Design a protein around this ligand. Structure first.
Ligand SMILES: *Cc1c(COP(=O)(O)O)cnc(C)c1O
Ligand SMILES: *Cc1c(COP(=O)(O)O)cnc(C)c1O
Lengths: 356, 356
């Protein structure tokens, strides 16, 4: 769709994303798969990912913020959408207006949300209650308070107790069941992320929340080792040589740098130039990376910096190890400046945020 | 202008940027100040920054890529624009069509570019030749090739040899090398070698344009430059979030995380919660950050993560030290998900990429 004018880009394999989504629905054929497309689908492009997943049966998405929900709605996503973070109470009408479900983290928040609803928006307010079941970050910890909140919701016909959830293990899961069994059960009961949806069946819940594994990565090497399914990595990060120089070794200049999310710490990494592992030398610049190459490498040759294979020296996890971080952040680092080139069979289309 | 629905954002002070720009033109009254707004003006937002700079006399911008240049043209920018990186030769008509000047890094590139020009685009191709004066990076290192490239340009009425440039005891040799190469051929209209450091520290009688980048935004390229200069620079960026929930030692939850550019390494940093220095504890998550806070801290309290002062424990340089990187990268890391709230006098307007 969009044009692009620099030879540096991500390939995003939508067939891989659909195939990983199908792993989850195949393994839990009686659960709603709430696809987590927060943070711009972990760097891949939430609008195009969410649209593709809807074309592959997805009916419920989760995002981190209301902006992320609205962005989906504005681009024709009609699926159910849950915001996982805490909406500012003043913005309540906007969530009601765009048919966006919200997370209830506390009784205080719910009381404030109610006070901010005017008569202007009159559609249902869909609510999922977040229980803190030990972990200790966002959510309601006491059963009594859980009951109070349900009672407040039932007071208002505009408010819907659509769901209840938590986030992680065995003891915590038991705590979740104990809290939830102390009250009427809502339509959606969910506690599993990617790891949970791969490791545990959890028959008590009727919906799951796979995030990173939809895009083809395990949340940890333990999960990768423990669970004997196959995920398809969806991302390649590619750049073409723009100039070669001899300075007894040839070097190649790539039009990509830390402003694209190829961080300075990548210096000393190896990248893939037509089959050859080539070291990244000298400082990674804002817009340029230098690679030590064999003498036959010329301007126009493609370089794989991130490859769509788990067992690869350019894999996301190896990139994460170089960055002293986790695969999640490597992907989130990839910046707006990179066109995303979506592959769906032999169909190819491009998002380029700079020309929107 | 734009609305936003999460209490995390950047304040961008356009008055500070205009003031820093004025520092450069005051230091160099006889030089064109080619304001570098590449990489979305180092995270500030290239459109809003370039528009503001044009309103304050700026007539020439430099960007990294043609996409960045067309982005400016699409938003009313009429100034000259130079692309500093290497355009794919097949896209040459697009640069010509949009009156964007291009960098010549090599003879080979130039011949490829000329081949791709359509008989039907007949506006000028404005060219700046990049010289490699000792860095062994982008551009022409040999005087004979430089002359050969000029002579090729002279053969085509459609092409203009508009400029020649390079990029920097180390730098004394390079400067002499630049003067020597340029003196061996006809001089073009624009001669330029100085970045922010070069512009703050050197005269360069020979050049007639400068290319300040990071210092336009209020940051020194190094402590050494900060110490040696007699000017003041005004930092232009704050990074702010509000507490969304507190839990009892009181902890505070912030709606910002590593997907926003506040990377996992920020764990153990201190932030400013209404005047109190407070430690980032536990893991920094994709969308959420946990801070140890005084008992009096409540939902809604504002927190400075990056402050607009050089001598602050939340300064961009301190943040860079925590990230084991440089100030440039800290800025570049700040993701599309954060609204930019522009300040210009008492005027305030918001850019929110997700709702664009
Ligand atoms: C991010 C998130 C998920 C998804 O986690 P992954 O490890 O990426 O699968 C699930 N639930 C909540 C509440 C989240 O915030
Ligand atoms: C980025 C850049 C500059 C400006 O560098 P700063 O240190 O940010 O001033 C100057 N010239 C070229 C070619 C650049 O790429």
């Amino acid at each position: 769709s969009d044009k692009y004018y620099r030879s540096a880009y991500m390939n995003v394999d939508l067939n891989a994303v659909a195939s990983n989504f199908k792993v989850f629905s195949t393994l839990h054929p009686n659960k709603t798969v709430m696809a987590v497309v927060k943070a711009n689908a972990y760097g891949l492009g939430s609008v195009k990912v969410a649209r593709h997943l809807m074309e592959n049966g997805a009916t419920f998405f989760a995002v981190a913020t209301l902006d992320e929900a609205i962005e989906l709605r504005m681009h024709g996503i009609t699926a159910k959408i849950l915001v996982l973070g805490v909406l500012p109470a003043k913005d309540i009408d906007k969530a009601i207006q765009h048919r966006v479900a919200l997370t209830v983290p506390s009784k205080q928040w719910l009381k404030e949300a109610i006070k901010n609803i005017s008569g202007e928006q009159e559609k249902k307010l869909w609510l999922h209650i977040k229980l803190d079941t030990g972990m200790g970050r966002l959510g309601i910890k006491d059963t009594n308070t859980y009951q109070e909140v349900i009672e407040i919701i039932q007071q208002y016909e505009q408010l819907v107790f659509e769901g209840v959830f938590t986030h992680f293990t065995t003891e915590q899961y038991q705590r979740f069941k104990d809290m939830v069994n102390e009250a009427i059960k809502p339509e959606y009961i969910h506690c599993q992320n990617s790891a949970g949806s791969l490791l545990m069946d959890c028959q008590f819940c009727n919906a799951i929340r796979p995030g990173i594994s939809l895009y083809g990565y395990y949340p940890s090497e333990y999960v990768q080792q423990k669970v004997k399914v196959h995920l398809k990595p969806s991302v390649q990060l590619i750049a073409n040589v723009v100039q070669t120089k001899t300075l007894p070794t040839t070097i190649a200049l790539l039009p990509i740098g830390y402003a694209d999310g190829y961080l300075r710490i990548m210096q000393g990494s190896f990248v893939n130039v037509n089959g050859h592992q080539c070291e990244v030398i000298g400082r990674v610049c804002m817009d340029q990376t230098i690679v030590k190459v064999p003498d036959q490498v010329k301007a126009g040759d493609s370089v794989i910096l991130i490859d769509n294979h788990r067992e690869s020296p350019q894999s996301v996890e190896v990139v994460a190890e170089k960055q002293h971080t986790i695969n999640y952040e490597v992907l989130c680092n990839l910046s707006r400046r990179l066109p995303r080139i979506y592959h769906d069979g032999d169909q190819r289309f491009v998002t380029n945020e700079l020309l929107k």
